[PDB]
């Protein structure tokens, strides 16, 4: 309910700090093209139910738009617009040629079936094919969406445009023309960011104590990368608890025994709750778990020098203020979790070029982009006495506002 107002307020703060007039705020508060469509669908029983669609292009002054698609049964226009603005901020921070956007459908993948999902996606594309194209829009994977849906969308856009357009949609399967490393992008991004933050703060990465709560694919890949680099992991947690060992935890063995879900806790052994896990001694803390964990009570108990919010807004304003007062570096989530967007951009570039890179090349390009962006934001945040979240928002809005001013819409 408050997501749109919060986004507008933070955008207003960033614009005020920049010093641009109010015309840029007036233009950027609201997405420039919101479309609501109704998608007919045929169920297995033969009955027809109508799903409500959505699509929002926050801005396209920079160039082609981009956004994900969530099959979340509570998706609404306010959430869609807020997510479009958020994606635009991500693109601005990473310095991509994207403007920003988001789509969604009001449905329930749980009760929905396989062929019915196929037909739903196909009807969605038939509905919104007019305002979507290689130079106008670019769907991407998101909540309740993955490679099969990407492939169906690609196949249908090929059918409707009568010519192959692999670069039309990102996140495709490898055989269809996908990009390698699509699953470890977030882990690689957070690895680069933690490395650079440690370098800037003087904390030696060699022997650095690390805690990774939340052991999904992101946590597993981050732990593996930290172990490869040299830093020791002194804590892991998952849905079934956690562990603790000041002198390493055999990340190789943990990954070898890693199951489908990433659960690692023993059966007949006591576990440590995340609340006490946060308090354990460590140099860097990486909350990548349920949101609203760092608050006033645990702000005084946190001990890590560097906190990276790989998740979406795991902290709160009070916790951010307390950490800033304590002089604990806080990495914004907008920069922490941009690996997915960066790898999607690389996939789009590969499709457009028609030639596919390799894992090493993707690694090098991704790390270069991440280090450059992090260095720029760190320099700006130290030049101006502000919080890193404010610096991230300000940097993200700078490119969009300046491009709009050049293009003369204002």
């Amino acid at each position: 309910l408050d997501v749109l107002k919060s986004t507008q307020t933070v955008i207003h703060k960033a614009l005020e700090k920049l010093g641009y007039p109010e015309e840029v705020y007036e233009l950027l508060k609201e997405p420039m093209r919101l479309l609501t469509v109704k998608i007919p669908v045929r169920m297995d029983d033969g009955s027809v139910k109508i799903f409500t669609g959505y699509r929002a292009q926050h801005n396209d002054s920079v160039g082609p738009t981009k956004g994900g698609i969530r099959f979340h049964p509570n998706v609404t226009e306010k959430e869609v617009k807020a997510l479009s603005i958020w994606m635009s901020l991500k693109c601005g921070i990473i310095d991509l040629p994207y403007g920003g956007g988001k789509g969604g459908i009001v449905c329930d993948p749980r009760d929905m079936s396989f062929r019915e999902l196929e037909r739903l996606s196909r009807g969605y594309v038939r509905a919104i094919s007019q305002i979507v194209g290689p130079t106008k829009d670019v769907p991407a994977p998101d909540v309740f969406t993955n490679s099969q849906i990407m492939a169906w969308m690609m196949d249908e856009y090929s059918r409707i445009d009568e010519f192959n357009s692999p670069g039309f949609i990102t996140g495709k399967p490898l055989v269809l023309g996908g990009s390698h490393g699509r699953e470890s992008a977030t882990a690689k991004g957070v690895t680069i960011c933690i490395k650079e933050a440690a370098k800037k703060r003087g904390i030696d990465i060699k022997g650095a104590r690390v805690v990774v709560q939340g052991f999904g694919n992101a946590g597993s890949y981050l732990a593996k990368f930290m172990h490869d680099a040299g830093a020791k992991v002194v804590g892991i947690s998952d849905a079934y608890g956690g562990l603790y060992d000041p002198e390493g935890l055999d990340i190789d063995y943990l990954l070898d025994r890693r199951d489908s879900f990433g659960t690692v806790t023993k059966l007949f052994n006591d576990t440590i709750t995340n609340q006490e896990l946060l308090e354990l001694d460590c140099d860097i803390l990486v909350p990548a778990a349920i949101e609203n964990q760092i608050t006033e009570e645990n702000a005084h108990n946190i001990r890590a020098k560097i906190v990276v919010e790989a998740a979406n807004g795991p902290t709160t304003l009070e916790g951010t203020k307390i950490l800033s007062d304590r002089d604990i570096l806080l990495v914004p989530d907008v920069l922490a979790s941009a690996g997915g967007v960066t790898v999607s951009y690389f996939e789009w570039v590969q499709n457009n070029q028609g030639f596919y890179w390799s894992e090493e090349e993707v690694e090098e390009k991704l790390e270069k982009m991440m280090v450059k962006s992090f260095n720029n934001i760190y320099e700006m945040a130290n030049n101006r006495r502000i919080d890193m979240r404010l610096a991230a928002y300000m940097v993200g809005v700078r490119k969009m506002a300046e491009a709009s001013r050049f293009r003369g819409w204002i």
Binding site: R110, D111, V143, Q148, E183, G216, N217, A239, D259, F261
Partner: protein, 1483 residues
């Protein structure tokens, strides 16, 4: 019983090896028992290579080709000739059409007269068939494949015809002889063996035990290829999975021969035959024998940190395509030119083998099987678990297991395949939604929830991290008899292992467990590559809401998902058929995961019982050969107990999503109770349910969830035979019972009531584990309780009669209430029948744990029963020796029944000799397949002193008897106890179960005088609640089956059956007697007489009446009196006598077994579902004798003890004078010393004699359980090597074991003791000059030992004493060690850290001067008595040795010792200091 082989490594052949193998079999014979007559052969056979020399010399009419280019067959025929020649022609036709040329046929001469009567009667005819080789068959592997094809086709044709014939073996390198023969009879019978023309490389052998007295020639092994030991507990799920994969096997080596070989296993065959069939198919498929053996019997690959990465990947890959075959087993297979030997994943059988300078490996069960030159013996090793003893005749070397395993693992890139092809289903963290229905109460009532169930089963799980406990085991009537509507789950009772296999533990043996579950579709087993492993794998069977939604939302084309509505309207058959149609349509489309959901259920659609639906789907899928292509996930609301969970997994469910339980937790958290967060609560519930599932698995012994998944380990009680065959095929049911229509009516009634529910918004209180007025009826209602108490206290007979009437009539409580007398006979006067004094001598009090009860209550029970003249009992908690002397007032607190439980707490020479009878607690009614836990808080000093443990230390009683790994070991223990107390009667305690008749027959053959059948209705001090409710069966079925089986086998006149469990009335006593009881046990009723109010809080140790609490404050409130118990027993006897007058029976043995006087009451017919039961099984009397007359002749005579030792030692023992003798002992002599120890203890007592009074010498191999129950003052110099269970139950004295005199190699590095040593001992010394076996010093409780290395699981459950290991140590050392010390020598400290189990042990380095001096003195005595070079070198280098030693001590033991030492230094008395330290520790 056992196995054996005498192989020459280099390949040279002679008749000497065959003769030595026959001698080995003859020596092994002694292990088995006696059947109907000693001449009968329970089963034995011998295996050799093809004797081409003898064949060419003898046949004289076959042009035998070269060695490898033909095969030899062995066929068993009936006595008739028409079918013989018909089958001969048909086999020739098979060979001709397959293209091979038949060389001819031969008849084996046989000596029929050299055989016992039964085997002579069943003597089948033998003919050997010679097969030819065509030029196309270049390779002997192809030749063997064609021979296997021919054999399987012939077997298929035979079974189709219905004839009775068997192929003993058909191979080009193995010919097998076997039958119902004793080894001394085999040579005479098979006159071929006597010829001096045989030349073989190896000679495998085996002797069976034949649990039942009716075996057949075919069943007895050696099988076609391998010899098998023990039993397989997964042989139903095994067969189901194998039949499922049968339809889908495809390969190129067999071509189209799979159609011919479609039946790959014998359904009617036993475990050994089934294993041989499957193994032979796998190895013929194109895999190496070692590779397929490793595939079938894997090591513990999950939870083990001592395994290499290549091995872990190997086993992870193979577990994904083929399940493990758990159970006690010692495989020893062959393939003509290669040999192997394996133990199960837990190593539950002994295997010790020799090596000589002439390359003569002697692998056998025991050590002294044959005479060997100690100057030529080279290695004395043990086949440790997870180690492959592999031999290759052509190479003539013992190929090392490490390199075999390494190269097998590296043959393929399994690590890369696992790393790459695994599928990730990482859920979205932003897709969270705490689901709610808004009809929580309605759904809960529909699925049968109760407020009692919630508040007593769900909150306690979260609070305690484990399943909640209980006491006073279930007494409610069965679901089939209960009038109240009950879910289908209550009809199914869990099962457990009694004999032929131990119930393995879980918490302490976590390294062996494996909870990995695979979801998806298996690939081509015969040619597997990456698609067998492109599957989802889970860590726990249970699932959370987020996980379930992720699985459903996965849209990968290979891993599809389908949802099937498991609901019905009127016709259950229509519903099941429709569900099958959806399933098969989805499979045709290509799905791999099925979701059975009970959601979307309204007043018009009701849910099928999830167990029934899952079983029907699984059976249909298995029958149609598509189960391997799908994965059945189940989402049913009625899933909240570990019992329901285990039933679902066992009968097919891939995963469970207790959405109803999760919603209930959400509602409670929203309300405010259970303050813990929702996610933490969900995780804790999942972990607890997985722990419970592991516990249920451990009860049976299946250590793998994957194996248990196929395994059907439930016994329906009240389901019709037709329904069982249709949907639950393979399940055991005795009485038939309700039908599908009745089940549907019950479900519809429950659903309609729940969805009506138009009066209140509350859940009716449950009555499963407590009594609430208007709820489910219970046996002990307050009316019965206080009527019984009043009658007993008043000595009034009318009140007792009213109590009996109330307890028996007005309801259906048990099966025995459905029996009624005919009423038309000749009554006899009360003065003409046997008397009450004669009645009361056949009663028992049942085992009563001293820890569970109070001293006052226990002494009252004992005094009452002893005064009455019956037989009291003492629980597993031992007994203070002060009770063995009558008091001045005449009271006698001595217990006539001394119990020998798994703990072996108070087992001692005095404690055993001062007794009248001995029991062996194989299991109890409540917690059969589980042990116990007595934490520091509940173990008081006045209990610890009696139980021989430190005060305030949490004791652990292992579930299984570590001395009982099979019926042979049970017989050995029975003999040991009889030798310990020649003047007592041995007893065993079983529980009613399917096959209990077979187990009883086996026990009777094992020569147990008395068998006790205890129903699950019996009580218990503490046990898990689901184990209370859903374990065991009523004792009526067990007693009936045992009596029928025993008296059919002919051994019923050699044992004395008994009964106990809710024997509350003389009517119950008469029912038991008619069913075939002889003596009865009353435990729950005496407690009620004494003052117990059935409050069900014994586990809490807070009894308000002070009957089962150790607190002195509560004990002061006790009010019992032995007079009340005497009155109760007298009233029971008088009522029984009145019924004897009514029935006109003159004497006990005259009435016993007269089941013809029983007929079903009309009330059973009136009952709406109980009328569908079939009672002819219990109402049936085969001809025979029905009373104990024979004395159950033991073999105490002719023992070396009585023959030689005692006759020259009576004077020494009686005069207290020193005496020395030397004796030659062979493996046949089993115990060798327990008799002298018992004599010493009886003559003197606990004090014993001065140190080193009797110095017995010994030489050569010793027998099993050598030197058991040796008291203080004795000394057994055993200058040789021994067998298992050395020093069992030691109670003082020394035991010195040194290698042979002619053995010059590293005796400190060659094993010299069996698996288990010093089990349950209390105090003594020991000096072993060599490595020990697996589970060394299992329950040491004060015995100091010195060993040079030990096996695995060593020092498992120590509670005192000390151990000094001068060498390496196996994995999982000190698993559960709650006391004592272990000065373990080691060099690689970190490797020792990793090997040890870190749960409950703290490590140090020696700093105490007293500790150093004690170790130095122990090593000095060790060297002085042994002359060990390792010990001498350690003494020389003491300076380095003190630094290199490592000390291990538990935290609680260390803290208690420190506190008591501090108090003693302060200067307080021992008792007060102990009490103060205990209070401080357990505040």
């Amino acid at each position: 019983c056992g196995i054996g082989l005498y192989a020459h490594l280099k390949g040279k052949q002679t008749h000497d090896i065959v003769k030595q193998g026959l001698k080995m079999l003859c020596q092994l014979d002694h292990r088995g028992g006696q059947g109907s007559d000693p001449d009968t052969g329970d089963g034995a056979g011998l295996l050799v290579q093809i004797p081409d020399a003898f064949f060419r010399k003898e046949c004289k009419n076959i042009n035998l080709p070269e060695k490898e280019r033909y095969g030899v067959g062995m066929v068993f025929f009936s006595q008739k000739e028409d079918e013989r020649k018909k089958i001969e022609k048909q086999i020739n036709a098979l060979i001709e059409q397959e293209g091979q040329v038949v060389l001819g046929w031969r008849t084996v001469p046989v000596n029929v007269g050299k055989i016992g009567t039964v085997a002579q009667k069943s003597c089948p005819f033998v003919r050997q068939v010679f097969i030819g080789a065509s030029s196309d068959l270049k390779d002997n592997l192809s030749f063997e494949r064609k021979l296997y094809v021919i054999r399987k086709q012939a077997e298929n044709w035979g079974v189709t015809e219905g004839l009775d014939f068997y192929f003993a073996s058909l191979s080009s390198q193995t010919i097998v002889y076997k039958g119902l023969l004793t080894p001394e009879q085999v040579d005479a019978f098979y006159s071929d063996l006597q010829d001096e023309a045989f030349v073989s490389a190896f000679a495998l052998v085996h002797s069976r035990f034949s649990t039942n007295t009716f075996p057949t020639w075919e069943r007895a092994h050696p099988n076609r290829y391998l010899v098998h030991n023990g039993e397989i507990n997964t042989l139903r799920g095994n067969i189901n999975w194998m039949r499922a994969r049968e339809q889908q096997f495809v390969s190129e080596s067999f071509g189209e021969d799979l159609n011919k070989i479609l039946p790959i296993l014998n359904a009617d065959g036993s475990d050994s035959s089934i294993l041989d069939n499957a193994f032979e198919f796998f190895v013929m498929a194109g895999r190496k024998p070692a590779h397929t053996a490793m595939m079938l019997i894997p090591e513990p690959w999950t939870e083990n940190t001592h395994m290499s990465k290549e091995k872990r990947a190997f086993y992870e890959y193979h577990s994904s395509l083929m399940e493990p075959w758990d159970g006690p087993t010692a495989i020893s297979f062959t393939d003509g030119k290669q040999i192997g030997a394996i133990l199960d994943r837990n190593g539950l059988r002994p295997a010790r083998y020799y090596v000589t300078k002439d390359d003569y490996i002697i692998f056998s069960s025991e050590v002294g099987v044959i005479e060997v030159e100690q100057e030529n013996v080279l290695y004395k090793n043990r086949l440790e678990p997870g180690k492959m003893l592999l031999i290759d005749l052509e190479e003539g070397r013992i190929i090392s297991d490490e390199e075999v395993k390494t190269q097998i693992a590296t043959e393929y890139p399994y690590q890369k395949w696992l790393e790459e092809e695994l599928v990730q289903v990482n859920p979205d963290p932003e897709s969270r939604e705490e689901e709610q229905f808004s009809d929580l109460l309605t759904r809960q009532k529909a699925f049968g929830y109760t407020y009692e169930d919630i508040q007593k089963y769900l909150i306690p799980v979260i609070k305690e991290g484990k399943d909640p406990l209980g006491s006073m085991g279930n007494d409610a009537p069965l679901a089939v008899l209960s009038d109240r509507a009950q879910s289908l789950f209550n009809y199914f009772k869990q099962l457990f292992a009694q004999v032929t296999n131990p119930p393995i533990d879980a918490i302490r043996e976590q390294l062996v467990t494996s909870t990995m579950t695979w979801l998806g579709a298996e690939g081509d087993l015969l040619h597997p590559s990456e698609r067998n492993v492109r599957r989802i794998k889970l860590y726990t069977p249970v699932l959370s809401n987020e996980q379930f939604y992720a699985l459903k939302t996965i849209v990968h084309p290979d891993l599809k998902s389908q949802k099937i509505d498991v609901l019905f309207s009127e016709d259950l058959e229509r519903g099941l058929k429709d569900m099958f149609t959806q399933a098969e349509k989805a499979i045709s489309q290509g799905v791999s995961l099925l979701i059975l959901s009970d959601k979307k259920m309204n007043e018009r659609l009701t849910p099928i019982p999830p167990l029934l639906a899952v079983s029907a789907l699984h059976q249909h899928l298995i029958r149609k050969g598509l189960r391997t292509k799908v994965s059945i996930i189940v989402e049913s609301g009625e899933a909240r107990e570990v019992h329901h969970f285990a039933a679902l997994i066992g009968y097919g469910a891939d995963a469970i999503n207790p959405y109803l339980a999760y919603a209930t937790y959400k509602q409670e958290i929203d309300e405010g109770r259970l303050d813990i967060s929702y996610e933490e609560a969900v995780s804790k519930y999942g972990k607890s349910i997985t722990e419970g599932v592991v516990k249920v698995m451990s009860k049976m012994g299946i250590s793998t969830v994957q194996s248990y998944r196929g395994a059907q380990i439930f016994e329906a009680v009240g389901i019709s035979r037709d329904v069982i065959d249709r949907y639950f095929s393979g399940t055991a049911s005795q009485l038939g019972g309700i039908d599908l229509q009745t089940i549907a009516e019950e479900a519809q009634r429950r659903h309609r009531e729940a969805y009506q529910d138009d009066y209140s918004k509350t859940l009716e209180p449950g009555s499963d584990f407590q009594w609430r007025n208007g709820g489910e009826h219970h046996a002990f209602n307050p009316k019965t309780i206080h009527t019984l108490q009043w009658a007993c206290r008043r000595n009034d007979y009318n009140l007792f009669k009213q109590y009996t009437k109330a307890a028996d009539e007005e309801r259906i409580g048990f099966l025995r209430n459905l029996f009624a007398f005919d009423g038309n006979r000749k009554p006899l006067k009360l003065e003409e029948v046997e008397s009450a004094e004669s009645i009361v001598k056949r009663f028992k009090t049942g085992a009563m744990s001293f820890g569970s009860l109070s001293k006052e209550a226990h002494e009252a029970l004992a005094i009452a029963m002893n005064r009455l003249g019956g037989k009291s009992n003492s629980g597993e908690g031992g007994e203070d020796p002060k009770r063995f002397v009558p008091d001045e007032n005449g009271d006698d607190r001595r217990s006539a029944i001394k119990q020998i439980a798994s703990g072996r707490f108070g087992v001692k020479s005095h404690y055993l000799v001062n007794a009248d009878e001995l029991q062996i607690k194989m299991a109890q009614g409540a917690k059969p397949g589980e042990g116990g836990q007595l934490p520091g808080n509940k173990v008081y000093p006045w209990v610890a002193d009696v139980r021989g443990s430190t005060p305030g230390v949490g004791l652990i009683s292992p579930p299984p008897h570590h001395d009982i790994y099979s019926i042979e070991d049970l017989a050995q223990l029975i003999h040991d106890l009889k030798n310990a107390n020649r003047d007592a009667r041995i007893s065993v305690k079983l529980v009613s179960k399917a096959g209990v008749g077979t187990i009883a027959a086996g026990v009777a053959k094992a020569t147990a005088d008395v068998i006790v059948i205890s129903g699950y209705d019996g009580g218990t001090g503490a046990s898990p609640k689901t184990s209370i409710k859903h374990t065991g069966l009523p004792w009526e079925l067990g007693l009936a089956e045992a009596h029928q089986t025993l008296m059919l086998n002919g051994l019923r006149d050699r044992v004395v059956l008994e009964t106990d469990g809710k024997l509350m009335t003389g009517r119950d006593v008469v029912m038991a007697a008619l069913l075939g009881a002889e003596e009865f046990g009353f435990a729950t009723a005496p407690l009620v007489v004494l003052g117990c109010v059935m409050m069900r809080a014994c586990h809490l140790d807070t009894c308000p009446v002070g009957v089962a609490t150790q607190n002195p404050e509560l004990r002061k409130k006790f009010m019992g009196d032995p007079d009340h118990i005497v009155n109760y027993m007298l009233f029971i006897a008088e009522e029984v006598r009145e019924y004897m007058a009514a029935l006109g029976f003159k004497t006990f043995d005259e009435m016993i077994g007269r089941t013809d006087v029983l007929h079903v009451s009309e009330r059973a017919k009136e009952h709406w579902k109980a009328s569908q039961l079939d009672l002819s099984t219990l109402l049936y009397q085969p001809e025979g004798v029905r009373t104990f007359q024979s004395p159950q002749n033991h073999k105490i005579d002719q023992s070396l003890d009585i023959t030689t030792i005692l006759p020259a030692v009576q004077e020494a023992i009686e005069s207290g004078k020193e005496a020395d003798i030397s004796i030659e002992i062979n493996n046949t002599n089993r115990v060798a010393g327990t008799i002298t120890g018992s004599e010493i203890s009886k003559r003197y007592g606990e004090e014993g004699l001065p140190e080193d009074t009797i110095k017995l010498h010994f030489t050569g191999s010793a027998g099993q359980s050598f030197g058991a129950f040796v008291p203080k003052g004795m000394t057994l110099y055993l200058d040789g090597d021994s067998n298992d269970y050395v020093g069992k139950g030691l109670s003082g004295g020394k035991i010195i074991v040194k290698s042979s005199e002619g053995f010059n190699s590293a005796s400190d590095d060659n094993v010299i003791i069996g698996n288990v040593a010093f089990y349950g001992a209390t105090s003594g010394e020991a000096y072993i000059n060599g490595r020990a076996g697996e589970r060394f010093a299992v329950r040491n409780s004060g015995v100091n030992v010195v060993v040079e290395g030990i096996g695995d699981h060593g020092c498992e459950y120590m509670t005192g004493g000390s151990v000094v290991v001068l060498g390496d140590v196996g994995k999982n050392f000190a698993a559960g060690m709650s006391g004592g010390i272990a000065y373990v020598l080691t060099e690689d400290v970190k490797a020792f850290k990793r090997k040890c189990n870190l749960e409950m042990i703290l490590f140090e380095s020696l700093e105490d001067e007293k500790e150093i001096q004690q170790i130095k003195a122990m090593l000095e005595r060790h060297t002085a008595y042994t002359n060990s070079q390792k010990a001498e070198d350690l003494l020389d280098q003491w300076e380095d040795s003190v630094k290199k030693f490592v000390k291990v001590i538990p935290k609680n033991y260390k803290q208690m010792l420190a506190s008591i030492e501090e108090q003693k230094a302060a200067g307080l008395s021992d008792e007060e200091a102990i009490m103060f330290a205990f209070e401080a520790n357990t505040k």
